[PDB]
């Protein structure tokens, strides 16, 4: 949640340093449309580093 | 066959594809869960009128 | 173990079973070679007797 982001031609590829986060911060947005994920199933993106 | 179970309900058009197994949607959330084998079938039609 | 923490139980059975087959074929190649190697050992033991 921020101001109006850039278009697809400009990528804000962000390096996230050492920190501690969970899915509660992600969960703040109900209008999630594309919830499809690969690699790890979305029910277990917690308690693994 | 052995025994058939028919279940009828009313959902929206964007929720029709959410009845597919092995995925999560508005219907495949905590509202409804369905077994991954699914020997049965899903048939849906318009009821606009 | 990490595969179990990685993916859902419907999917990745296609990754489990190929690893099952590749290991049981290794067992098959091992015990076939063992039954081969026991044959001349038995013949040599009979000759020694």
Curated annotation (Swiss-Prot), chain C:
Function statement: Subunit of the fusion protein that is processed upon entry into the host cell. Mediates fusion of the virion and cellular membranes by functioning as a class I viral fusion protein. Contains a viral fusion peptide that is unmasked after S2 cleavage. This cleavage can occur at the cell membrane by host TMPRSS2 or during endocytosis by host CSTL. In either case, this triggers an extensive and irreversible conformational change that leads to fusion of the viral envelope with the cellular cytoplasmic membrane, releasing viral genomic RNA into the host cell cytoplasm.
Name recorded for this polypeptide: Spike protein S2'
Full-length numbering of the shown residues: 978 to 1026 of 1273
Gene: S
């Amino acid at each position: 949640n921020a101001t109006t982001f850039a278009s697809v031609y400009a990528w804000n590829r962000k390096r996230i340093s050492n920190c501690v986060a969970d899915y509660s911060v992600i969960y703040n947005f109900a209008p999630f449309f594309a919830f499809k994920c690969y690699g790890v199933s979305p029910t277990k993106l917690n308690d693994l580093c | 066959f052995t025994n058939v179970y028919a279940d009828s309900f009313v959902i929206r058009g964007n929720e029709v594809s959410q009845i597919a197994p092995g995925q999560t949607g508005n219907i495949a959330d905590y509202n409804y869960k369905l077994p991954d084998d699914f020997t049965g079938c899903v048939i849906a039609w318009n009821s606009n009128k | 173990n990490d595969i179990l923490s990685r993916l859902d139980p419907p999917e990745a059975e296609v990754q489990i079973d190929r690893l099952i087959t590749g290991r049981l074929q290794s067992l098959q190649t091992y015990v076939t070679q063992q039954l081969i190697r026991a044959a001349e050992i038995r013949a040599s033991a009979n000759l020694a007797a």
